[PDB]
């Protein structure tokens, strides 16, 4: 309210963006990449899909076991 403001305004100039609140923001900025990519390296499987899609129209007639196709 009174004089001597911390971000005391130079007219139309950058209001002293403290680089400390910058460097903590970059701590968390590196932490988001941490959580997206060291989790990827730790277990890519979560976003990879484990096991594959066994496309039905590629299999054999024994495990499917149709009664003789000629019959």
């Amino acid at each position: 309210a009174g004089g001597g403001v911390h971000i005391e305004p130079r007219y139309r100039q950058f209001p002293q963006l403290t680089r400390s609140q910058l460097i903590q923001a970059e701590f968390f900025s590196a932490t988001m990449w941490f959580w997206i990519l060291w989790r990827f390296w730790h277990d890519s499987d979560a976003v990879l899909g484990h096991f594959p899609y066994p496309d039905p129209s590629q299999w054999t007639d024994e495990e499917l076991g149709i009664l003789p196709d000629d019959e």
């Binding site: 005391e8 950058f14 970059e26 900025s29 990449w33 941490f34 997206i36 060291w38």
Partner: protein, 81 residues
């Protein structure tokens, strides 16, 4: 820092992208009625921000460092065991 008012003659249209639209209205045959109060809002101090992905890539080179540190962590875990 009590009201560091700057000179007005310095913050004019020249150099700023508002000159291009000033050229545009020059094609229209006109002069900008206000095109100077925002010269600061075109200078690199507050204008010219990083891209939206660039904003998303907030220090992603530190993420590339995380690449190596995590890979080496698992590599020395497996190598010595």
């Amino acid at each position: 820092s009590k009201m560091e008012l700057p000179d007005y003659k310095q913050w004019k249209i020249e150099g700023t992208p508002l000159e291009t639209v000033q050229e545009k209205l020059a094609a229209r045959g006109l002069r900008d009625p206000w095109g100077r109060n925002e010269a600061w809002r075109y200078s690199g101090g507050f204008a010219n921000n990083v891209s939206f992905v660039g904003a998303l890539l907030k220090g992603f080179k530190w993420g590339f460092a995380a690449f190596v540190v995590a890979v080496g962590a698992e590599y020395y875990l497996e190598s010595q065991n």
